[PDB]
């Protein structure tokens, strides 16, 4: 059998998949630790590595990146799980090492690969607490370029009334995803502050792992590919909507949860987004 993680469901994905919208013909770049291209519940179009000592985009020594990739396009068959956007073209931009550590200039470089190779959507489930002119310039050019940009809010829970949203998700040009449970309760580790856009399912999110394995993980990291797969379905319905239209759509049809320092606009609902 194949199972549908609750998260794909929280967000109303199947409603779309019912009407023929599976993210098909859409180019999603997962910037991360790479992606096991040899797993059966994934099909990887292409990708590249900015990691100098780790140059095969298709070898995920961290597993992280494979987990994420699976939340976007886990294939739709009779085995494994189910991605949010199952027919989406997946790209492995590796900018994270085996230790899940990557220099800003690797991140930056990965973004640049994606702009040139015309990805439609980019997922960055990575982040650091300080930003920079280049990184910001980086995501800013993606957006000018027409790419939808998504990224994890951060895992620093709360801290006074100060913001705990890391980069690049702090940047207003990036959709920043926080995390909720099967109950729409924000996970505790979830970052807060005014730079948060929406929430998505990011607690015990079961996806694919390197070596034909499947397992469950927690993090704002798991929330992003929900929004990324989301963006992707909307483009399979409306392929000449601008990123602005798609962004705008996602944030104006959220189910509102708590106060916005903790939840932004609320849990996305792609069913409601695709109109």
């Amino acid at each position: 059998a194949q199972s549908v993680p609750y998260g794909v469901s929280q967000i109303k994905a199947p409603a779309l998949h019912s009407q023929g919208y599976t993210g098909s013909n859409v180019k999603v770049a997962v910037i991360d630790s790479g992606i096991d291209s040899s797993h059966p519940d994934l099909k990887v179009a292409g990708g590249a590595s900015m990691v100098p000592s780790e140059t095969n985009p298709f070898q995920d020594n961290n597993s992280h990146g494979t987990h994420v990739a699976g939340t976007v396009a886990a294939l739709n068959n009779s085995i494994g799980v189910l991605g949010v956007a199952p027919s989406a073209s997946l790209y492995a931009v590796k900018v994270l090492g085996a230790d899940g550590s990557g220099q800003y200039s690797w991140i930056i470089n990965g973004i640049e690969w994606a702009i040139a190779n015309n990805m439609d959507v980019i997922n960055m489930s990575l982040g650091g607490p300080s930003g920079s002119a280049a990184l910001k310039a980086a995501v800013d050019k993606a957006v000018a370029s027409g790419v939808v940009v998504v990224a994890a809010a951060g895992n620093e829970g709360t801290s006074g009334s100060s913001s705990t949203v890391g980069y690049p998700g702090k940047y207003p040009s990036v959709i920043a995803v926080g995390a909720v449970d099967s109950s729409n309760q924000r996970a505790s580790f979830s970052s807060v502050g005014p730079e948060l856009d929406v929430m998505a399912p990011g607690v015990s999110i079961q996806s694919t792992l390197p070596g034909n394995k499947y397992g469950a993980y927690n993090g704002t990291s798991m929330a992003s590919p929900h929004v990324a797969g989301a963006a992707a379905l909307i483009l399979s319905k409306h392929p000449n909507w601008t990123n602005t239209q798609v962004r705008s759509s996602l944030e104006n049809t959220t189910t509102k949860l708590g106060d916005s320092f903790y939840y932004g606009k609320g849990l996305i609902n792609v069913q409601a987004a695709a109109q």
Partner: protein, 107 residues
């Protein structure tokens, strides 16, 4: 005669123990650097830099980690300038912690 000796542990978990230690090392800067630390000389150098004060170890600036939450707990116990120590911290994941000092957590 720098009375100096530390020991470092790290395990998944949110607290000292209700979180086993999966890795443990010892460092000693006094007089010179030694211990079980696949990076002694720098750590000493690190603490020296910050003059033995965990709480003041510039994180990263230009390094990003995966936004997964697999909390890790760091314990440090010993003496520095014959001053006692009993620090413990929790990083959201293990990359965070590694981006933390430079080499203290070079572990």
């Amino acid at each position: 005669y720098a009375p100096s000796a530390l020991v470092l542990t790290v395990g998944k978990g949110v607290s000292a123990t209700t979180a086993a230690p999966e890795r443990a090392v010892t460092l000693t800067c006094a007089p010179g650097p030694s211990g079980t630390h696949p990076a002694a000389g720098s750590a000493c150098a690190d603490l020296a830099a910050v003059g033995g004060d965990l709480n003041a170890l510039t994180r990263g600036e230009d390094v990003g980690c995966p936004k997964v939450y697999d909390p890790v707990l760091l314990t440090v116990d010993g003496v520095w300038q014959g001053k006692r120590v009993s620090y413990e911290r929790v990083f959201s994941n293990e990359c965070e912690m590694n981006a933390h000092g430079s080499s203290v957590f070079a572990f």
